[PDB]
Amino acid sequence: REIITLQLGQCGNQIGFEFWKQLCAEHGISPEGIVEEFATDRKDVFFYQADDEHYIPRAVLLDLEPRVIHSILNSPYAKLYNPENIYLGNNWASGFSQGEKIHEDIFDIIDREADGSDSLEGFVLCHSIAGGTGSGLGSYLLERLNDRYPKKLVQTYSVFPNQDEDVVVQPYNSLLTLKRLTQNADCVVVLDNTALNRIATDRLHIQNPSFSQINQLVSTIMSASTTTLRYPGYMNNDLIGLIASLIPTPRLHFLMTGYTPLTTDKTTVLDVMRRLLQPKNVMVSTNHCYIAILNIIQGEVDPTQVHKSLQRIRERKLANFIPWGPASIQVALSRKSPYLPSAHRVSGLMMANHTSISSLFERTCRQYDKLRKREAFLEQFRKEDMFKDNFDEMDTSREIVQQLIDEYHAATRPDYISWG
């Protein structure tokens, strides 16, 4: 139904602003907010139908000691949306404490926008893992959304800002935030800026404006993930129906992302299918195995040899699903939206529950573990000591994430007829 977007952190506000400019260009709206004569799809999933004959977008901007938010403000896409939800450290404990002291009025901002809608389906959060101002604050307020709203769904869009390796307090913040993402979130979309940056430097000659083009990539992935909700389709035009199928267990809910065009400067669905299974197309990268795969393909093709393509991929015999489960690739087809010129309009995406990310979780675990062993790279700020003098929250996050790694490895194996 109606889904409210919450953006916090500098990186989260940046990718949210890029996404809102993307939907401004996509749908028939001005940079003013008014509906145009090239509007008619559903425009009530992200835009509040306002009383100005303006489809005013539901964009809740929160920040802590803002810098780039002022550069967002002096632009014609910060008066695109203005329903009065615009509001004005570098550690997880410091951001947690600073979010603690000002939680009331921004939670009142959340409450005002929550009753302002006719209906509610989900709160989707723009976040960056250990992004500084976003970290700690986002974990605390994520806990407060899961506490205050048990009837609604929480989605988290999170990126890991790393320029191919690194901050020494970053594994602590990622461990603590990942504990919050495990137990206070319903679905977490995790991306690696290292792999995306390497693919971006490969595909073009972009090396200095890598982050700006990464914003375009994340905006296209976000718009393609919600296109079947924004545009009239058939299935899972709520968030929860889309989220439900990929998750077999509520702790394996971290989804790997895929994207078919490696540059966008006429094929059948068979080619992009056998493409996107292979890890040249995965932008976020024992043998670790998929639990469930969901694919969304958007392009100008003639959709009947999809059953023929499923025949061909089946007996090409590339990939097998999980021992205990009779799982299956789940496939949806949509149209690529007009009002943006794109050569080769075929664009594919996969949303897949993969165990490979467990290794990367263990990678962060190993980093945190060695910094826990040396104790010269926790950097000893007074906010961290005042927040937790015993640092047993790190031990709780560590034991939960180690149970998560064991659950990952047991779900890969047929030890999910047993327990691990």
Place this chain on the structure above:
Amino acid sequence: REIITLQLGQCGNQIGFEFWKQLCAEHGISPEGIVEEFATDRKDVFFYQADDEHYIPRAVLLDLEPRVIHSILNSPYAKLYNPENIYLGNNWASGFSQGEKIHEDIFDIIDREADGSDSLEGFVLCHSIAGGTGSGLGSYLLERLNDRYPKKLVQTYSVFPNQDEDVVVQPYNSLLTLKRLTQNADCVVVLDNTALNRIATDRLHIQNPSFSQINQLVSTIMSASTTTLRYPGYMNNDLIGLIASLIPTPRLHFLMTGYTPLTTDKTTVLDVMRRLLQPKNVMVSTNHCYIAILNIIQGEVDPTQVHKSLQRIRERKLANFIPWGPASIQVALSRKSPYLPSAHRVSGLMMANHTSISSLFERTCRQYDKLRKREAFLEQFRKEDMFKDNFDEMDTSREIVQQLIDEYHAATRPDYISWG
């Protein structure tokens, strides 16, 4: 039939002057008084058909120590009406005593205008609750109209001047004036300048000229309330037939006001119906429940679906009327008058008997009660001591208004098959 307008107090004379300028612009009359060639509706409800071929309005202006009345006088709409009824403290007791000493000649002004008409239907009073010069004087003369004229009807238009909180003698004057409004008035229209001022500051960027635009809002509400009498319609073209249906008991006769356009800078009746029930449209704001609702809708629309809209609102199942009574929303339709340009000519109004105002009565009761307990905010003027040395009129007003609060709460419940 023929209804005489009495305006007293500075705020009452201001909103009356705004209403008379509104009907000067509305009907085919000059700023001179003469009928024009764009006159033909009924013009004998508020304008005396005078012998000059002038429709001279029946506007009785009374004042006590006038200030703004001189600014009213030097204007072309103070020689719009002149049938010779123009006449020239800050407490309820002081205004009461000053109205006592000069009651004879202004009552002779009332008598002259009363026999000056061919017929009489009602005396409608422009008033402001604890407005200073208006308060006390208006209560005393209201008692004298109810004493001297038992065959005629008295209506009171009253606003509560409060700039979002406040005068410390104001709860005393409102309590005493409300006692007079209970037992000497037939219908009281009560508005809150706090809620109207907040909605006015919200809808536009008016904050300093809020009072002048509030005069326009009150003038439009007054003109829309009497449009079916001024313009040829079907039903309740006397005051008493309009007043009779909303009142089940002569002490619940205080009516909540509604107004559909939140700014006026093509819809069906279904939309404005499901709008105006919701408290974003109520300009004057256990769960307190309506006893009876009357709605007047004025706009250019096709009413072939008002019965369909009643079908839809019935089975949308939003609101229920009172346990003991088989009450119903009562609906009338009129046309929005020409000779004023208004974008979106659909404008809706509700006149509804609501128990919610009892809480606001209790709010004033609580304020008066705490000032009665402290006794440093009655401000001890000699007029108050000379008027009542024992202050038992406050006790009488308090016991009557407490019986009113109990009657409100018992009428909300099914204890109006019993007594409360």
Place this chain on the structure above:
Amino acid sequence: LDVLNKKYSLLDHMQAMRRYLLLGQGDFIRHLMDLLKPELVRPATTLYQHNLTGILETAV
């Protein structure tokens, strides 16, 4: 061909027969199942037919 295409409509109206009757528009069916959850899951085999037609008229 043209007398069914210009005096009434044949092609335009068959699309909605696909969309509703054969459930060819599942946005329609999803929100019909969401909004009409209580009146279905509670017995409506003692409720007159015109009420369900009337609530369908606003559901579409």
Place this chain on the structure above:
Amino acid sequence: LVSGFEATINKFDKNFSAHLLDLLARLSIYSGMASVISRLDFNGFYTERLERL
């Protein structure tokens, strides 16, 4: 005094309740054309005071 007033009010209250519930109930058999009956009884409080059928 009130031995004349309250007597008429009580008897007319009970008489009015009986006959009016009867009008709404005897129109419920007709139908659609079922707008009026519990449109005068806006679904909720006063769905009744005397149960019908």
